[PDB]
Design a protein around this ligand. Structure first.
Ligand SMILES: [Ca+2]
Length: 781
C-alpha cells in the first residue's frame, strides 16, 4: 500500500476514444500554453502531425514563440537518440534570449539488476501550465493517429505514419525510401486516452517534476562524476538556506525548481469526477526521486498516506480491487494478457520446441550429416563459435546446391538466435512462470458468481497477436505465453472458470471431497470432464480485425488493441499505460502511469436489461462509445465493413445475457467469414495440415490445431519432431505481395458478410506448440 497519490474529487475528465481526437485536442492545448509544457513518453516522434497539418515540433515552436516565458520539457525514454536532442536544439534555435526548451533522456530505474537494461519508462503523460493533464495509452508516435473508420489505406499518410510492423515495405516514397505499397494495408490503432482538469493534475505534475529532477541528480554520465554532483547539490542547497536566513567535473543540472513551473497544492473539492493517479514505480526509481527533491529543493506538498519510499504497484492494485468489487460485469481492453497460469500445459510430448520455433533455433531442424560434419553440437554446448570444424564448413561451402547454402545460412542464424538466449540468461535470474494475478482474480470473481448463483460476465478485447511479424522469436513467445494464460496453462483463465463450473455442477450429486477427482477424470478423446463446461456464460474473448480492397488486392490485417483500459459496472474506469503482463503490473520493472476514475454525476440504466442499476455517466458513455467504435456504428462514409446494427440494441445492457450472446454470436460469424477465405490469419483449425492417416490420430479429431504460423504444416503428423514447412505464404513474407519472377502471387476471395470489427479469439491456436524463444522469461513476463 505504497500509494503514489490518493483520490481527489472535483475533476473534469474527457475521454479520447480515437488517436485523432487526442492528437487534435493536444494541439489546441499547446495553442494555449504560457508557463510550462511537460512531455514524457515511451517514444516521442517530433514529426507526428497533431491536427493533420502541424507537427508536434511546430506546435512546440509556435508556442515558444508566442509565450515568452514558456519553458518546454521533454523526457523521452532512453533506448539502448541524437534525434531528440537535435530537435530540442532546433526549438531553442534563434530564440529570444537563452534556451527555453530542454530534454533529458530518461534512463530506466528498475529494480532488476543486470536484467535492468531490458526495461523502460512506459508512461504516456503530457502536462500543460500545470492546468491540463493528459495520460493514457497513446504515445506521440507514428501510427497512433487513427479514427473510427479503421481504414487500411496506408497511402494517405507519409513517412512511417504508414505504420505496419508485420509487413515488408515494398513501395516507395516520392519526395532508404521504402513505405507501404498502395496495395499493402496499414495496421490500425485502437487506443484509449484522456484529458484531466481539476486537483488531480497536481499529482500528474508531481510525477513529471519529481521524475525529471530525479534523472538530473544522476545525469552524471559516469558513476564517478556522480558523487561530485551529489556533493555540489548538498552545497548549493545549504547555500540556498543560508541566503534564505538573511578534467573531472559533472554537468550543470537543469532543475525544475522555478516557481512558475511548480504547481500549487490543490484544495479539497467536491463533485465532478473522482480521480486517483497511479504508478508502477521501482524502489530505485523512488529513491532517485528523493534524490532530486534535495537537488532541486522541490518538496511538493504530499497527501497524507502517500509514500516517498518503496516499490509502487498502484496499477496492478487498483485493477485487482475493481475486479473484486465488480457487481455485474467487467470490460477490459489490453494489448497484453499474460498472467499467472500455473503449470504450462497442452504442449505435445515428443516435440520439445514447436516446429516453427525449432526451425529457428533447434539444430535438429538441419540435416544430421552437415551438423556432425562441422561438429555443431560440440560448439553449441561450449558456446565457442570457433570450436567448429572450419575445415568441413569449407567443404560444405564448396559443395554446390541449395541444401549446402541454406545450411550454412540457417546455421549461423540459429547461433545468433541462441546466443541472445544465453545473454539474457546470464544477466540475471529467470523467474519460473508468470507472477501477476489478474487471471486468478478474474477467475475468482467469476467463481464467486458461479458459486452463489449470480450472473456475471467478463469481456476481453486483445490484439490478434503482438504487433510485428509472426516469425520474430519473442513475438512468437508472447503469443505462446498469451494463450497459456487464456486457454492452456493448467491453471489458465478458462480452465479455472471451467473447473469451477464443473465443481458447482456436482453440488448435491456426489460427495464434496471426491469432486476434485471427478472433474479431473478423463474422457474418450483424452480430455478431462471439467472441459465439458461452457465458460462462454461468463467470459467473452474478442480480437479486432478489418479487411479491404487495396490496389485491386483483397487484404486483411488486425486492428491493434493498444488500449490499457478496464471498466466495471460502468461505475469505475482504470486508464493508462499498464499492460496485463509482469513488466507493467509488478511495480519493480517498467515504470507506468494510470488513473482510476469514477463519476459523481449519476445515471440510471438496466445494465442487465431488467433491474435498475446506477452508473457513472461519463464511464457509462465511454464504454458505450467504445462498443460503438468496434461495432462499426461510429465509422463514416467508406470502408469495406458494414455497421453491425444488430448490436445497436445492446449498448446499454452489457450485463444482460442476450447482450454477450449477441456479441459472441456475431464475433463467431465474423471470424468464420474471414476463415472461409483467409488460411493465414491465426485461427483454431489448421487448413494446410492434412491428415495422412486412415483415422485421425489421438485428439486430432475435428481437426488439427493451427500453428503460430497457420499456413505451416508438419511433414509427418506422427513425427511432429521431424519438422515441416510453410505450405503457403504468410503476410510477413515478400512472396506474399510480389510475384518472385519464378512463382506467382496468390490472392483471396473477399470476406462475405462481415459486420463490425469484432472477432473471435482463437481458443485453439498454437495448441500443442511450445514456442519458447529461449530468452530469459523475466524479460518476456
Ligand atoms: Ca468507414
Amino acid at each position: 500500500s505504497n500509494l503514489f497519490s490518493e483520490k481527489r474529487a472535483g475533476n473534469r475528465v474527457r475521454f479520447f476514444t480515437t488517436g485523432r481526437d487526442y492528437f487534435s485536442d493536444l494541439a489546441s492545448a499547446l495553442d494555449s500554453a504560457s508557463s510550462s509544457i511537460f512531455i514524457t513518453g515511451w517514444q516521442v516522434n517530433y514529426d507526428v502531425l497533431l491536427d493533420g497539418r502541424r507537427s508536434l515540433w511546430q506546435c512546440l515552436r509556435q508556442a515558444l514563440e508566442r509565450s515568452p516565458a514558456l519553458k518546454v520539457y521533454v523526457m523521452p525514454w532512453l533506448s539502448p537518440d541524437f534525434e531528440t536532442m537535435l530537435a530540442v536544439f532546433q526549438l531553442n534555435a534563434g530564440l529570444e534570449g537563452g534556451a527555453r526548451a530542454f530534454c533529458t533522456p530518461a534512463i530506466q530505474q528498475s529494480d532488476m539488476q543486470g536484467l535492468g537494461v531490458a526495461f523502460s519508462h512506459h508512461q504516456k503523460s503530457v502536462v500543460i501550465d500545470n492546468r491540463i493533464g493528459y495520460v493514457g495509452g497513446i504515445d506521440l508516435a507514428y501510427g497512433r493517429r487513427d479514427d473510427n473508420d479503421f481504414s487500411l489505406d496506408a497511402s494517405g499518410r507519409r513517412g512511417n505514419d504508414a505504420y505496419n510492423p508485420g509487413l515488408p515495405h515494398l513501395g516507395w516514397m516520392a519526395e532508404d525510401n521504402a513505405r507501404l505499397a498502395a496495395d499493402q494495408p496499414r495496421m490500425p490503432w485502437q487506443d484509449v486516452h484522456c484529458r484531466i482538469e481539476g486537483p488531480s493534475v497536481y499529482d500528474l505534475a508531481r510525477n513529471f517534476i519529481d521524475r525529471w529532477n530525479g534523472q538530473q541528480a544522476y545525469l552524471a554520465k559516469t558513476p564517478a562524476l556522480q558523487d561530485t554532483a551529489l556533493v555540489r547539490s548538498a552545497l548549493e542547497a545549504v547555500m540556498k538556506w543560508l541566503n534564505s536566513l538573511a578534467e573531472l567535473d559533472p554537468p550543470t543540472p537543469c532543475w525544475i525548481n522555478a516557481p512558475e513551473q511548480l504547481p500549487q497544492e490543490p484544495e479539497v473539492r467536491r463533485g465532478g469526477m473522482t480521480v486517483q493517479v497511479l504508478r508502477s514505480a521501482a524502489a530505485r526509481m523512488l529513491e532517485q526521486e528523493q534524490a532530486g527533491r534535495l537537488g532541486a529543493g522541490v518538496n511538493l506538498p504530499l497527501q497524507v498516506g502517500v509514500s516517498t519510499e518503496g516499490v509502487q504497484s498502484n496499477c496492478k492494485d487498483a485493477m485487482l480491487l475493481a475486479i473484486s468489487g465488480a457487481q455485474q460485469f467487467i470490460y477490459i481492453e489490453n494489448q497484453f494478457f499474460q498472467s499467472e497460469f500455473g503449470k504450462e500445459g497442452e504442449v505435445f510430448k515428443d516435440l520439445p520446441l514447436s516446429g516453427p520455433m525449432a526451425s529457428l533455433r533447434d539444430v535438429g531442424s538441419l540435416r544430421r550429416d552437415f551438423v556432425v560434419r562441422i561438429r555443431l553440437e560440440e560448439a553449441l554446448e561450449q558456446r565457442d563459435l570457433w570450436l567448429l570444424d572450419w575445415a568441413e564448413v569449407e567443404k560444405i561451402a564448396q559443395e554446390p546446391g541449395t541444401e549446402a547454402r541454406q545450411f550454412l545460412k540457417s546455421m549461423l542464424a540459429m547461433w545468433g538466435v541462441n546466443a541472445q538466449g544465453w545473454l539474457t540468461h546470464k544477466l540475471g535470474e529467470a523467474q519460473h512462470g508468470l507472477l501477476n494475478e489478474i487471471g486468478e482474480a478474474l477467475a475468482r470473481r467469476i467463481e464467486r458468481a458461479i458459486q452463489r448463483e449470480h450472473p456475471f460476465h467478463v469481456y476481453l478485447v486483445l490484439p490478434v497477436h503482438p504487433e510485428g511479424a509472426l516469425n520474430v522469436p519473442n513475438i512468437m513467445h508472447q503469443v505462446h505465453l498469451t494463450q497459456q494464460s487464456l486457454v492452456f496453462g493448467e491453471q489458465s483463465l478458462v480452465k479455472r472458470i471451467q473447473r469451477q463450473m464443473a465443481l458447482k455442477a456436482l453440488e448435491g450429486k456426489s460427495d464434496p471431497a471426491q469432486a476434485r477427482e471427478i472433474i479431473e477424470r478423463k474422457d474418450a478423446r483424452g480430455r478431462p470432464v471439467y472441459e465439458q463446461q461452457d465458460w462462454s456464460r461468463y467470459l467473452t474473448l474478442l480480437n479486432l480485425r478489418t479487411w479491404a480492397v487495396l490496389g485491386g488486392r483483397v487484404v486483411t490485417e488486425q486492428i491493434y488493441v493498444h488500449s490499457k483500459l478496464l471498466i466495471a459496472d460502468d461505475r469505475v474506469a482504470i486508464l493508462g499505460s499498464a499492460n496485463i503482463n509482469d513488466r507493467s503490473l509488478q511495480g519493480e520493472r517498467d515504470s507506468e502511469l494510470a488513473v482510476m476514475v469514477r463519476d459523481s454525476e449519476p445515471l440510471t440504466v438496466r445494465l442487465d436489461g431488467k433491474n435498475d442499476a446506477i452508473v457513472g455517466k461519463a464511464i457509462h458513455q465511454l464504454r458505450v462509445n467504445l462498443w460503438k467504435k468496434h461495432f462499426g456504428l461510429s465509422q463514416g462514409p467508406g470502408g469495406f465493413v458494414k455497421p453491425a446494427s444488430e448490436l445497436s440494441a445492446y449498448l446499454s445492457i452489457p450485463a444482460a445475457q442476450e447482450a454477450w450472446e449477441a456479441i459472441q454470436t456475431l464475433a463467431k460469424e465474423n471470424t468464420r467469414a474471414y476463415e472461409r477465405t483467409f488460411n493465414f490469419i491465426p485461427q483454431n483449425i489448421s487448413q494446410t495440415q492434412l491428415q495422412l492417416t486412415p483415422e485421425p490420430p489421438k485428439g486430432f479429431e475435428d481437426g488439427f490445431p493451427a500453428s503460430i504460423w497457420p499456413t505451416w504444416a508438419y511433414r509427418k503428423p506422427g513425427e511432429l519432431r521431424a519438422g515441416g514447412q510453410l505450405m503457403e505464404p504468410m503476410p510477413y513474407q515478400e512472396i506474399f505481395w510480389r510475384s518472385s519472377n519464378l512463382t506467382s502471387v496468390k490472392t483471396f476471395p473477399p470476406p462475405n458478410g462481415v459486420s463490425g470489427f469484432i472477432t473471435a479469439l482463437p481458443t485453439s491456436w498454437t495448441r500443442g506448440e511450445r514456442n519458447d524463444s529461449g530468452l530469459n522469461l523475466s524479460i518476456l513476463a
